[PDB]
């Protein structure tokens, strides 16, 4: 029962600074102490210095390819995260990665699935994060990691991302909480038959049924390891106001944590990302910590 | 696939001014552009000038019969709306009427059912809007349109409302979202066996079951056209603060739009009212637009 | 159909003053008038003077046994409440007790079950209120009444509580709404197999199923009288901000009142506490009144 808390203070996936402060804020909130109380032997893993990285992010406007912003810096930092997370998983430790914007998932998902090839990925997000290189409008790479992970628009992915192993398949990723999906993304999810449970489905079936369906969708044998990549903007701005891309109307605070409890309950969680905490906009950070505690086993009654 | 956006800037059904600004605010928010994007060939229909009408509303205190306020002005303006909506439906266009207080529904429901006799009416509201002429306490006619439409308290309805066709029957109207029903209204709903799904039923069965039951209640053959008259005060003041008669605790923003999606889904929507937007109290107007988009086919994933 | 509104202005169960103002605030809000409208012949019962009691509470810091605060004052005041509530029930009247912090339930539960031995108790609360004398950390007795009622940690309950009849058994108490349960309390609920429906269960099954399961848990014959002790902090601080121990994320305003309607519906409610209203922190007091009205029969539609 060992855990590595992977610190990924990266902001180059989106315009706003402050999200790179995520990891330190979560840790100051007592994240590591929380995990130890739940019985986890923890250690911290520093992938890079957030301030040095932020310096290059803020300065280097020339880091563009087409509409895509910072593909070089992002490719470098996410390869670092990949190597770290992969080693953690090979060591037999649980990789709990704290972001940082969601572009870091390019490294975390690649890292985990390289060790666990049949791992399912549950993407908890208001967004699909699957815009292609030529398809993206904002050019913000935190809205693109799944397209790169899936190898979509192959001929337009820059050489600096050549390091990304092709280990994720469309039938191994399930969305929960979608409500701001771009037109291009809509077509992609449809064409690729990706399991997508939007807010419509949560409203229609309830969060318990949705989580069950999401788990089943990425675990046919019912035995597969499961990874969750958790964007805090899935949770309605009423609870998560300090996040870069707030969307209504999202998960309640209750649904957001219940989701974690159902996942913890299934006992097959192998890795977790908690991303897009931007402290410069207590609630957002305490929600991040709460997600961690519930995911890693904290319950309301005796266990 | 043609639509007429019927502008009904009327405020004479209730004391507060500002609700007559509804139509222009929704249009400035981009309502017409939204409908065109969804594939609708649209055009605007101006029934009357809201400023001229508001002038007579604010001045003419003598327009009273008993406790009922502005029965003459209301009867005149709603007859205009009736003739417009009826012609739109006869032209084979979808009447999307923007209010304006809910007294305009006297014209919209009469207009639609005169063309579609077997159309069901789903009344989304915190209130029953079915107080009679002699029964009303406030005397505000936006809380009375269904009594007139149903022909209740026949001997006490003023001659100026003689134009109203008797086309609505009690078994063709279903409420969703009730939580502030007057004692007299309670008795009426009971005595007439009107399908009424209060917040209790939403809490008990969930919004999906409630919407299903409401649709079934007004469509026995499962083939009948369906009209929705949507009062924005059904939605909890937390989401719709700028409305004349706010009531707790109502539909969530999510339930309010999910309702629209289920209706759009059934494919039998023939007309829609969006009423009681009072901008003088972004959320309320954007909610009004959102209701329209979801009702007319906008989905979270690919369609 | 007779009711006694038992006024229990007690604050000695917790540090904060103001909760003793509960009863008067609820009454000024029109609590008694509300009950009369619902058909109840009401009368007020003053157990003690809240100002005189508050005077001794604020002054007497020496009233401690170990970590437990004010065991003497609490034992005295709750014995008074016990004798009052017991007499009310023997008179054949409905005891509706307004607090006051939740330590008053030591008197109300004892009073009711002494007259109705097979009565079930539904404890609506964010907390378990079952910390023992030696187990409590805060030493606040409003978090301890159920341990005393159940006779737990027998050898450490002060002599001043010797008056408490042992009438409550573990299989006759059901929780609804738990989300802040101490580690010691968790073990107790588990060891004693007490029916506990946390926010997890509300999230998982919905409030209707939870209330049904709670009623069944304390009423095997399906005939037993039912008592509800309602802590207003069960309701999310968004609706109940003026309460001493606010916890997220709790019941919605809708769930909180729906709960009351289901209970009223079963027709076996024999007594009700409404506690922990602390006006010095309109919403909180109006919620208290609303709980009362819904519990005692108020419905959204005709009845
Ligand atoms: N996809 C985005 C954001 C990417 C989010 C990255 B994440 O915060 O890590 O999930 C990107 O920058 O690529 C934008 C693109 C433009 N849309 C516009 C929009 C607004 C409202 C609605 Cl309902 C819809 Cl369907 C679309 C918002 C997300
Ligand atoms: N019916 C009303 C409002 C009519 C609303 C028109 B609508 O905004 O278009 O739906 C009218 O003016 O005729 C009043 C009458 C007095 N009641 C008092 C009341 C307050 C709280 C509760 Cl829980 C209940 Cl049951 C009743 C409010 C609505
Ligand atoms: N049990 C309490 C409060 C008793 C409430 C009395 B009531 O307001 O009448 O229900 C007492 O003073 O005895 C405290 C003890 C310390 N816990 C700490 C805590 C905080 C958050 C969580 Cl999630 C958990 Cl599990 C525990 C809070 C309640
Ligand atoms: Mn994301
Ligand atoms: Mn997102
Ligand atoms: Mn209305
Ligand atoms: Mn209304
Ligand atoms: Mn309590
Ligand atoms: Mn409590």
TrEMBL record, chains A, B, C:
<dbReference type="InterPro" id="IPR006035">
    <property type="entry name" value="Ureohydrolase"/>
</dbReference>
<keyword id="KW-0479">Metal-binding</keyword>
<feature type="binding site">
    <location>
        <position position="102"/>
    </location>
    <ligand>
        <name>Mn(2+) 1</name>
    </ligand>
</feature>
<dbReference type="GO" id="GO:0006525">
    <property type="term" value="P:arginine metabolic process"/>
</dbReference>
<feature type="binding site">
    <location>
        <position position="231"/>
    </location>
    <ligand>
        <name>Mn(2+) 2</name>
    </ligand>
</feature>
<dbReference type="GO" id="GO:0004053">
    <property type="term" value="F:arginase activity"/>
</dbReference>
<dbReference type="GO" id="GO:0005829">
    <property type="term" value="C:cytosol"/>
</dbReference>
<keyword id="KW-0056">Arginine metabolism</keyword>
<protein>
    <recommendedName>
        <fullName>Arginase</fullName>
        <ecNumber>3.5.3.1</ecNumber>
    </recommendedName>
</protein>
<comment type="pathway">
    <text>Nitrogen metabolism; urea cycle; L-ornithine and urea from L-arginine: step 1/1.</text>
</comment>
<feature type="binding site">
    <location>
        <position position="125"/>
    </location>
    <ligand>
        <name>Mn(2+) 2</name>
    </ligand>
</feature>
<feature type="binding site">
    <location>
        <position position="129"/>
    </location>
    <ligand>
        <name>Mn(2+) 1</name>
    </ligand>
</feature>
<feature type="binding site">
    <location>
        <position position="233"/>
    </location>
    <ligand>
        <name>Mn(2+) 2</name>
    </ligand>
</feature>
<comment type="similarity">
    <text>Belongs to the arginase family.</text>
</comment>
<feature type="binding site">
    <location>
        <position position="127"/>
    </location>
    <ligand>
        <name>Mn(2+) 2</name>
    </ligand>
</feature>
<keyword id="KW-0378">Hydrolase</keyword>
<dbReference type="GO" id="GO:0030145">
    <property type="term" value="F:manganese ion binding"/>
</dbReference>
<feature type="binding site">
    <location>
        <position position="231"/>
    </location>
    <ligand>
        <name>Mn(2+) 1</name>
    </ligand>
</feature>
<dbReference type="GO" id="GO:0000050">
    <property type="term" value="P:urea cycle"/>
</dbReference>
<dbReference type="InterPro" id="IPR014033">
    <property type="entry name" value="Arginase"/>
</dbReference>
<dbReference type="GO" id="GO:0005634">
    <property type="term" value="C:nucleus"/>
</dbReference>
<feature type="binding site">
    <location>
        <position position="125"/>
    </location>
    <ligand>
        <name>Mn(2+) 1</name>
    </ligand>
</feature>
<keyword id="KW-0464">Manganese</keyword>
<dbReference type="InterPro" id="IPR023696">
    <property type="entry name" value="Ureohydrolase_dom_sf"/>
</dbReference>
<dbReference type="Pfam" id="PF00491">
    <property type="entry name" value="Arginase"/>
</dbReference>
<dbReference type="InterPro" id="IPR020855">
    <property type="entry name" value="Ureohydrolase_Mn_BS"/>
</dbReference>
